[PDB]
A paper describes a structure:
Tau amyloid fibrils have previously been established to adopt many distinct conformations across different neurodegenerative conditions. High-resolution structures revealed paired helical filament (PHF) and straight filament (SF) conformations of tau that were identical to those determined from AD cases. The PHFs and SFs are made of two C-shaped protofilaments, each containing a cross-β/β-helix motif. Overall, these results establish that, despite substantial differences in genetic background and age, tau filaments that arise in individuals with DS and neurodegeneration are identical to those in AD.
Tau PHF and straight filament (SF) structures from the 63-year-old case were determined to 2.7 and 2.9-Å resolution, respectively, establishing complementarity to AD tau filament conformations at high resolution. For case 1, cryo-EM 2D and 3D analysis revealed the presence of both PHFs and SFs, totaling approximately 76 and 21% of the selected data, respectively. Cryo-EM helical reconstructions using RELION resulted in well-resolved PHF and SF final maps at 2.7-Å and 2.9-Å resolution, respectively. The docked atomic models for tau residues G303 to E380 were in good agreement with the map and confirmed the tau conformations are identical to the AD PHF and SF structures. Indeed, alignment to the AD structures showed no substantial differences, with an overall α-carbon root mean square deviation equal to 0.5 and 0.6 Å for the PHF and SF, respectively. As with AD, the filaments adopted a characteristic C-shaped fold comprising a β-helix turn (residues 337–356) and an antiparallel protofilament interaction interface across the 332PGGGQ336 motif for the PHF and residues 317–324 and 312–321 for the SF. Overall, for the four cases we studied, these data identify that the tau AD PHF fold predominates across a wide age range of individuals with DS. For example, we expect that the cleft of the PHF fold in DS bears an identical pocket for stacked small-molecule binding, as we have demonstrated with the positron emission tomography ligand GTP1 and as Kunach et al. demonstrated with the positron emission tomography ligand MK-6240 in tau PHFs from sAD.
Numbering used by the authors:
A (entry chain C), B (entry chain A), C (entry chain E), D (entry chain B), E (entry chain D), F (entry chain F): 304 to 380
The structure:
Amino acid sequence: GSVQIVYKPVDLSKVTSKCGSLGNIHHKPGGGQVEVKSEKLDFKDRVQSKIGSLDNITHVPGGGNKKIETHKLTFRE
Amino acid sequence: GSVQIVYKPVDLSKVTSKCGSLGNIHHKPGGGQVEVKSEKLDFKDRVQSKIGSLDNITHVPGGGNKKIETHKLTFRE
Amino acid sequence: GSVQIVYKPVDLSKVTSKCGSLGNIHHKPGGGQVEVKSEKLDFKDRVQSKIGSLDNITHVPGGGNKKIETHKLTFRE
Amino acid sequence: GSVQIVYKPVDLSKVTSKCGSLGNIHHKPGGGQVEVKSEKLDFKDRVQSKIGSLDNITHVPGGGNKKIETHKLTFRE
Amino acid sequence: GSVQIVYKPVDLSKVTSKCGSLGNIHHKPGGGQVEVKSEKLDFKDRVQSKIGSLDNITHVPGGGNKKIETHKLTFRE
Amino acid sequence: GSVQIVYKPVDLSKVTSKCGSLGNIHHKPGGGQVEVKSEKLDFKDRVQSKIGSLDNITHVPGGGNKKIETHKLTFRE
């Protein structure tokens, strides 16, 4: 017995943007209050966390485009 | 017995945008209050979490386009 | 018995951006208050964490494009 | 003709307070936003004013008692 | 003609306070935003004013008592 | 014609306070933002003013008592 696998996916996909001007962007928050109370924390594998935060983000990319692609080929005998 | 698999998907897909101007964008929050109370936290594999947050985000990408694609080819014997 | 695997995915994908001007971007927060109270913290493998934060980010990339791609080929006998 | 005025008001009035303890007082505001827009202001005699304010006051007097008294005696001929 | 005025008001008034303890007083504001816009200001006699303010006051007097009194005696001929 | 004025007001008024302890007083503001914009200012006699301020005051007098008194005696012929 013989097994042949040919894995040849072809990609020609374009993700693109055009813009004239980014322009006036104003981000003026007036800060509040946050309180968190806890006794014990206990984190193990691959935990990702935020506790007690007051964060402001202004994010103005000129493009900001994304292309996420994953190829997988498991085999067994 | 022989098994032949040919995996040749072809992609020519375009994700694209055009814009004249981004223009006036104003983001002016007036901050509130947050309180969280807890005794014990216990997180294990692949937990993702936020507790007690007061966050503001302004996100103005000029394109902001996404293309997410996944290929998978499991095999067994 | 013989097993042949050919893994030849072809990529010609472009992620691109064009912009005229980035322009006026103003980020003027008015800082608040944060309090966090805890007795014990206990973190193990691959934990990623923030506690008690008041952070401001202005991020204005001229492109800001991303292309994330992963190839995997497990085999067994 | 003769005019006699005797002005002899007698005051023995007490304004008083007693207290055991002032105790726990917490004042935790989360700041908002204020905007005021105007072209021209024009103020004359005895004007008292506030424009565009975000103020917090905690006032805990141990007594805090007031006694306001006014005596007046106009005369004409 | 003769005019006699006797102005002899008697004051024995006490304004007083007693307190055991002032105690825990917490004043924790989270600062906001204020904007004021104007072209022309024009103030004359006895004007008192505030424009564009973000003020916090904690005032804990041990007594804090007030006694305001005014005597007036106008005469004409 | 004769005019007699006797102005003999008697004051025995006490303004007083007693306190055991002043105690824990905490004043922890989180500073905000203030902007003021103006073209012309024009102030004349007895003007008192604040523009564009971010002020914090903690005032803990052990007594803090006030006694304001004014005597006036105008005369005309």
